[PDB]
Amino acid sequence: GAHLARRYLGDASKEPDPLRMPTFPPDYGFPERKEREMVATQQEMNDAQLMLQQRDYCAHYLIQLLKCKRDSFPNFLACKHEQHDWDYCEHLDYVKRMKEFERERRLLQRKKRREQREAEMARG
Amino acid sequence: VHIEPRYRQFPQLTRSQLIQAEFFSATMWFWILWRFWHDSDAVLGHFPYPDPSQWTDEELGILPDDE
Amino acid sequence: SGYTPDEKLRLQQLRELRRRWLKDQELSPREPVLPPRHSIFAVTHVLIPVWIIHYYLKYHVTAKPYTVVERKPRIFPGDTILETGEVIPLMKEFPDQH
Amino acid sequence: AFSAPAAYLTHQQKVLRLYKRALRHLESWCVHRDKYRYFACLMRARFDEHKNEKDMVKATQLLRQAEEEFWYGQHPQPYIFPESPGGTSYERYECYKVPEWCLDDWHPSEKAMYPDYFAKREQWKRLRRESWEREVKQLQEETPPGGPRTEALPPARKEGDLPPLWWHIVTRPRERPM
Amino acid sequence: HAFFKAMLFMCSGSIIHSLNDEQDIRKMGGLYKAMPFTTTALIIGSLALTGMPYLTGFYSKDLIIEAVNMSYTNAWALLMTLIATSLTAAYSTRIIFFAFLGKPRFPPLV
Amino acid sequence: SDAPPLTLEAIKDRVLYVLKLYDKIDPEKLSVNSHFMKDLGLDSLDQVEIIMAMEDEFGFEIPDIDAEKLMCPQEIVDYIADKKDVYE
Amino acid sequence: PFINRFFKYLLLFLITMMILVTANNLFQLFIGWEGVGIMSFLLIGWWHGRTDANT
Amino acid sequence: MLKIIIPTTMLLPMTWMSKHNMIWINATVHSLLISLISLSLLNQLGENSLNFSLTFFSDSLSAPLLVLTTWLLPLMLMASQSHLSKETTTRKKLYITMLILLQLFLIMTFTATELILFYILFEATLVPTLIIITRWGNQTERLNAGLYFLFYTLAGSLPLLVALVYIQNTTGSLNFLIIHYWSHPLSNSWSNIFMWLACIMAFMVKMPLYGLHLWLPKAHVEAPIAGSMVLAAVLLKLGGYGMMRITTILNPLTNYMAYPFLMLSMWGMIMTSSICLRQTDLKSLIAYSSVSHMALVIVAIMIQTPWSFMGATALMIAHGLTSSMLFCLANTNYERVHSRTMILARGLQTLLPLMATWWLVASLTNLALPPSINLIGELFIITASFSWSNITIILMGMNMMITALYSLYMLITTQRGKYTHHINNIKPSFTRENALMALHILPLLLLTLNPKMILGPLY
Amino acid sequence: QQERDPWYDWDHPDLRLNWGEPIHWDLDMYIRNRVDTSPTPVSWNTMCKHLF
Amino acid sequence: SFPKYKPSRLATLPATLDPAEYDISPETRKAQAERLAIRSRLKREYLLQYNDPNRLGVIEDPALIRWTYARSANIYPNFRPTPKTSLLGALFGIGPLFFWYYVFKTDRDKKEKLIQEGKLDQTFNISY
Amino acid sequence: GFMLALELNNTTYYLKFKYPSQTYKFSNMLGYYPSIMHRLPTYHNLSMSQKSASS
Amino acid sequence: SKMELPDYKQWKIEGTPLETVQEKLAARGLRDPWGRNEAWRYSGGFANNVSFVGALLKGFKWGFAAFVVAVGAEYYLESQ
């Protein structure tokens, strides 16, 4: 989707732009934000040679899954818990991305409406 | 295996081919049912899809239309 | 409609000659007068080529640098190196989001 | 393929060919047998409705209209028999056909095998050699002074004559040579 | 796709060699019972081609469709991919229906 | 292997069989030398239908110029024998 | 009658395809490319007396 | 290098003193021996050439040409003895003498140290070829072909001679070593422009360049089989060798005088490849193929890069072998049916299967199938042209397509389909013809195995 | 040559020619391994319009 | 009634759709008979030599020789310099040359001008 | 797609005959791509190669 | 080998769709004189055929039974 129809048929001024995003400071609405942390060091991720696109914030679960797969080679059905954990961490990452998109949309629409209201008040 | 023409009648069928066909159809259906029982998440999805409309502004940190 | 008697007669004669020729095309019993161990397959088709290739790679291709290049093995935390004996430390005390 | 063509086709021949083509393309359109039988009976009724028209001008006009209708309503992908000129096996075995005169160039060692076959081949060659001149003389007598007017050939008439120009027709390689 | 495409072509070739080198589906009739093993193999192959769950073609085609659905991509390409994956089931249905169901239509010399 | 070696007797049997299934022809009145035009009282379209039935029976197409001339079952049997190189 | 040639032809195509797939440089990949192209040309026109096969 | 020259001048009296029924055997055996002796010249240095004496020298560019010439002479002898059976003994000896003289002239031509001696031998090669074409050719057109062969050459080569002597009046020498070491740039004047044209046009005609090629189809169709073999295989390469030698004194003028010749070469490559698609004569197809390949070599020599020179050498050798083989293949069918029309004898694979295999291999090599040296030369020239200008890959690409088409067309027209019914005099292939095709084809793949022997001095 | 009758006993069955008849100037263009001019179920410049 | 089919150069008119065949006259029949007679005479002449036991070789076809000679050796004698011939020759033999010359000259001038300014990214461009 | 194809194939059992639409013609003859691109470019190329390049 | 044709008097259009076709042609005054020739395609062992959904579920019963038995065993195998 509905967001596509909202942007491409409705008002695109209040709709987020996926290419240019976020347009607000990360600490704008929040008083203090915790810096997102990492569990895998660059060196370990290099020796693991994951990929350049698999080196996201959920790399540690992938590293453990790969280690178990190598250890449990002949039994290719024993690597289920860690695969589930990696899937869960990726799902959390996607949920955070959805939260960022919703934050940007709400901030954009609220800011534009508030500026329009301020201009209308000053024009009266 | 010698089978002669029939001329407007049903062809002669040996038991082996029907046995093989039925066994392989049955094993395909068994595999499908077993895998659906044990790997349902691959068809119905694993994790719930959240609705962004039900997220409060406290966690999204948007100012209450004042500042 | 139909054939003419000349056409019918010619077809009959040609058909007779053609059937005679086709009959002559048949073979008498003596016509082809010809004038005057188990697992050896796996030895002469698998073992010998692999021996030759192993020789050629081990002692001729390897003799020159950068001819056989393998990508380095993956290293995971908790591993021990075969040569140096060095062990790789664990991974930064997981948050354990159980 | 076997019969000599004529100078032109008659109106009855054109109507019969149109009937055959229409039935075949209707069968192509109607896949199932009962449906084909139903609409084939309908088409036969449509064809024999105007069977008794004495005016040839109107008959040719109806033939023209039927041809136009058939061209418009033809199947873009009609059914073709596998060995018909459009089929998937039309000229499949032409590469296995070898002329008989090739056997004349075989080595004597090759001809040492199959002795009886080559004895029969010698008999056939002698028959052809003896009959050639009589075939030539028969062709000359039968033909009109102003050259032949059709591709038809006369048959044998005399005691032990053979139909002129028979060798290459009788000694065809085969339909499935190899 | 190598697996089930090659096996589908072998099943078609078995049918063609059975009915005297005939390839048109308009002249192939009821082969469900005349050719049981060929029927079973072709049914399985058509199911795998159409992305039936937990078969061979499922593990690649299903992931491909889900990957094109969640990408910053051309919308026309996505629509054409969806219409094509419908037409895949369409033509598999056509093959099965015309070749293996109904009454015989091949020449009577069986 | 492949198809059995079609023989003249089989061809005649099949031709007579397909002819005896036609409703416009009496089975008993039919002989191998029966004429379609004179003996049987059929028209040209009936001959065309019989020719198409022959083609469907034997799975190959008879050209029209060769098809019009065939008038009796013996002619059909001979034509199919010559087209298929049957000598026995 | 020429089934041996056919099997030989099938094997040559397989060899050329392995050459294509395992190539590490562009010249060897081109060798495999043109090899499978030529083998496809030869096998499509298996019945060389038929005009449509050559076309 | 008199160890190669003198044995040919000894072939002369040996042929003229042999028995009436041993001329072919003796000539073939001793020409094969001379080729084996000449094989030793491939041992070339990396810095300079083999300077045997004040008059003869051998480089890495001319050594493969000598080896190809010495290898081609026995092939010409084997191809000629079929249609020369009814000739008298004296005329057969004269034919063998003409071939021997042509080989001797070419051998000295490819190794001359001075430009004037090279010109003299390069012009002396005309007489045996003209005599062969105009005397032992089959049809009445041969005479006209001979004229077209002769004057087309001379009208381009006579000015060069003047230029040559003028150079010796200015630089003081015409030896290739002194010329290379004492080279100076050519200024921008009309005099220097016309000197460039005088030095270039002779070799341009000999290639031949498009628009100057009208003599080639006549000469290569009307000449006997050995004449066609020697014209396509070696005589076209004289122009390329000479242009490579002479371009050392023409810089930097070439940098802008190569434009019209480059455009003519590329567009005529396309045009002749297109002509080959609609040809009713089988020999003319091979002749126009030769024109296209030589146009490629002209482009390579004109752009003047090491890669283009290497590709030009490889393509010269490969095309010589390929065109000789194709001419022999066409000549076998002509000897069988006595007519050159392509659609006359069809479906020959059914009657001559091994000859069908030879046709297939020759056609595959013609369309540059990897990894043959044909493709090596073509691809090197293509890369050099792409470096010269990125747009060239369009035209070359078109040619790379069209060539293949007509190649396969020829094959499918002659070997596939159904045999002509009324042609019944097609006898099984002799051992002589099969040996001829095998001796044409095996060296091609052998050189494919070791491609550095034909890549020239720039390797 | 594709348009010629395929059921006639041509002297050259592959080329669909007879001995002695005049040969088209562009025969090698029309050898039926090549450009075909046979009629189509849908007329030209209607297939062109649909495809474009 | 039904939509009309209009033939083209590469999709000709069907024989059964030709108006000129449905309106026949006796002179048309005479012409058809003459054509059939000519064809039958040629066929008989060919077949006499085709079936001859003593014939060994190739039956010469004057039609093939005429076709090849017309396509090859009869072209120049029947050539006249006309405005159409001259215009087509000049166009098809000169225009492509100058077009390609302009294209390549412009491309090379742009490349050289970029080279002089020192901005062509010739890094690792060792082989030429 | 399964359901729609099955319905359209079951329709063929009815005793009805209708002339095809233009969409069916487009689909059956491969968008007319072989009918146009295998006749126009080949004809123009061969005609130009004989008339202009050769003659 | 050495097989003879079956008799021609057993092929009948009664009880087949050919009867329906003859019925509709009768109301129009027409006739179908070729029905017995196509009667063989409906007469013998080709009398009945499965549906598309029936074809898709060819061996569903045996496979389902085996799956049910396997699930029952697995449910009573974890009790170790």
Ligand SMILES: CCCCCCCCCCCCCCCCCC(=O)OC[C@H](COP(=O)([O-])OCC(O)COP(=O)([O-])OC[C@@H](COC(=O)CCCCCCCCCCCCCCCCC)OC(=O)CCCCCCCCCCCCCCCCC)OC(=O)CCCCCCCCCCCCCCCCC
């Ligand atoms: C729920 C959310 C999702 C929403 C999705 C959409 C919602 C709607 C759902 C369903 C919608 C479609 C329902 C079925 C489709 C119709 C099927 C059909 O056959 O109808 C019969 C009818 C023809 O049947 P017939 O000729 O009488 O049959 C002959 C015999 O039956 C011969 O018998 P036969 O044995 O040879 O068999 C014939 C054969 C085939 O018979 C045919 O030849 C007809 C071909 C029809 C199939 C085409 C469907 C795909 C369309 C793709 C088009 C791409 C754009 C093309 C651009 C062209 C530009 C000019 O029949 C079949 O095998 C089955 C056909 C297809 C059934 C399966 C359909 C599934 C795919 C379509 C639905 C997609 C669902 C999932 C998509 C979800 C995406 C979010 O079709 C039509 O007449 C309409 C076709 C639509 C063409 C649209 C193009 C526009 C036309 C006018 C243009 C005006 C131009 C203005 C000027 C411009 C200036 C430049």
Ligand SMILES: CCCCCCCCCCCCCCCCC[C@@H](O)O[C@H](CO[C@H](O)CCCCCCCCCCCCCCC)COP(=O)(O)OCC[N+](C)(C)C
């Ligand atoms: C069938 C094919 C046959 C083979 C064709 C061989 C090709 C030969 C063509 C020769 C290449 C170019 C010749 C001269 C080089 C430049 C040509 C000219 O266009 O350039 C301008 C020349 O300007 C004008 O063109 C003046 C020349 C005009 C007279 C030439 C005749 C052109 C008409 C075409 C006749 C066709 C010739 C071939 C006949 C068969 C440059 O101006 P400018 O900087 O001042 O001169 C440079 C020399 N400087 C430095 C000493 C001063």
Ligand SMILES: CCCCCCCC/C=C/CCCCCCCC(=O)OC[C@H](COP(=O)(O)OCCN)OC(=O)CCCCCCC/C=C/CCCCCCCC
């Ligand atoms: C890059 C430069 C060249 C690009 C190509 C431009 C067009 C090339 C035209 C080639 C002309 C060659 C003429 C002689 C060829 C030999 C004769 C021939 O092939 O006969 C035609 C033969 C017979 O037709 P059938 O349908 O098979 O009938 C058989 C049943 N009766 O069929 C063919 O081969 C025709 C092939 C010609 C195709 C030309 C059109 C192709 C255009 C492609 C351009 C699209 C580019 C794609 C871009 C992809 C995105 C990066």
Ligand SMILES: CCCCCCCCCCCC(=O)SCCNC(=O)CCNC(=O)[C@H](O)C(C)(C)COP(=O)(O)O
């Ligand atoms: C599937 C899409 C294609 C279907 C479209 C085609 C439909 C066309 C239907 C209309 C065709 C006609 O009625 S056209 C009817 C033409 N009218 C006449 O011919 C009247 C003169 N009678 C005769 O010529 C003979 O009696 C003859 C009738 C030949 C019988 O021949 P025989 O008795 O000696 O065998």
